[PDB]
Design a protein around this ligand. Sequence first.
Ligand SMILES: NCc1ccc(CNC(=O)c2csc3nc[nH]c(=O)c23)cc1
Ligand SMILES: NCc1ccc(CNC(=O)c2csc3nc[nH]c(=O)c23)cc1
Lengths: 233, 206
Amino acid sequence: MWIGVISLFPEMFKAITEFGVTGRAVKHNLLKVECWNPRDFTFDKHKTVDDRPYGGGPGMLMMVQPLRDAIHTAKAAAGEGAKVIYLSPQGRKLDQGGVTELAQNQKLILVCGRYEGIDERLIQTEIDEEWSIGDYVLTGGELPAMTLIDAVARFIPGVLDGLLDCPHYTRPEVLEGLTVPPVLMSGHHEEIRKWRLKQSLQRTWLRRPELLEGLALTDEQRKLLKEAQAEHN
Amino acid sequence: MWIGVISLFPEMFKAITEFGVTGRAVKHNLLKVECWNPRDFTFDKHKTVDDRPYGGGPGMLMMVQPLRDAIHTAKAAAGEGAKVIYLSPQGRKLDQGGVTELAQNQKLILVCGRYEGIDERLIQTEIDEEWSIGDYVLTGGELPAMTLIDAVARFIPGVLGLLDCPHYTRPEVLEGLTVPPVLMSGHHEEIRKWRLKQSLQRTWLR
Ligand SMILES: NCc1ccc(CNC(=O)c2csc3nc[nH]c(=O)c23)cc1
Ligand SMILES: NCc1ccc(CNC(=O)c2csc3nc[nH]c(=O)c23)cc1
């Protein structure tokens, strides 16, 4: 997979390319991430990357020429078929279904914005889609772009339902006097699977009940969920 | 604000400490971020940071001893009143109300998990709260921790309900597309912004 990035802080992307799972994907030529900075496309001594809005009022926008030229250089490096994504606080909110869709692309271009955003005409002429990583305010699109890279990289071959995970335990047998649930030491696989499934259903119900609303459950899951609910009283 | 971080990849945090608004906050002593790596708390030649789950199944967990010792060193650096946060897919899903609450803390300790996560008993013995950044799967807690730092840093003094109306800057004509004529005249007449914000919202989402 090839990923082009437009950012005023391209060195932030070393957090992705030099470390962990994405870092090993880069070293093994399974993932390639290339960055271009609009500041490097400026013509003036002050390397001006912002510009005033026609409307008026407060806030600046990214200057069109340096940003458009950087996007064009990423498009020329990408070649045919790259999808251009603008990371925006008001774009489509990312979820696992969204990640799965984005991961079908062999080539992506991720545009990070700063200030109040980008000119509407650049969205119409250079952007394919707009995406957000959640309903919270950040200083820019760099952390969202890196989050998107990490999520999609998991889908690349060679790099590596709907319920929260069950509790997990490892050594020691006694941690600050607290013991591991005996079923996990029993060697009874079906009892362990049913205990973990019941815990997963209970944790989903107590912490994130909305996740159960749009979820078809098996007879076993329905039976185990009712059991945990009854024991909760 | 002081933030302690537990991570197997502490160098990832330079993306926060060396650049942009958080980088500026660090340079002006408004924000301090200190990192400890569980690998530095290992006793064996192979610096083993993972361990096998009881009950089997695929996946490994973070080894308890190196992780617990690293958390303890961050707690000793923090002193009284630090809130310990585990970045977890099973945690409270972050939103702006959540950021506002987290931002009231002068001291945080952010614990980043790798592999399938951490021992449930470490959550009871060490963790104050669990937080997620969204309903998507990542390779670790580091990008969520950095996202949390950036969001809360906006609340530090000295650092800084509708869909937006479209905005325009130079040039007047871009790829044959002109700026709406309204945007070059009357201040009150520009109430076309308020209408476009409503018109965009009605057409996009509710
Ligand atoms: N005044 C409106 C305004 C404008 C820009 C910004 C800067 N933020 C981003 O560029 C951003 C990109 S994707 C994303 N996903 C979640 N949260 C975010 O903030 C983001 C914040 C708020
Ligand atoms: N199979 C269980 C499992 C365990 C760990 C991980 C690694 N992920 C995290 O540690 C994480 C922390 S906060 C967050 N917020 C959104 N998404 C995330 O993945 C995260 C993924 C899946």
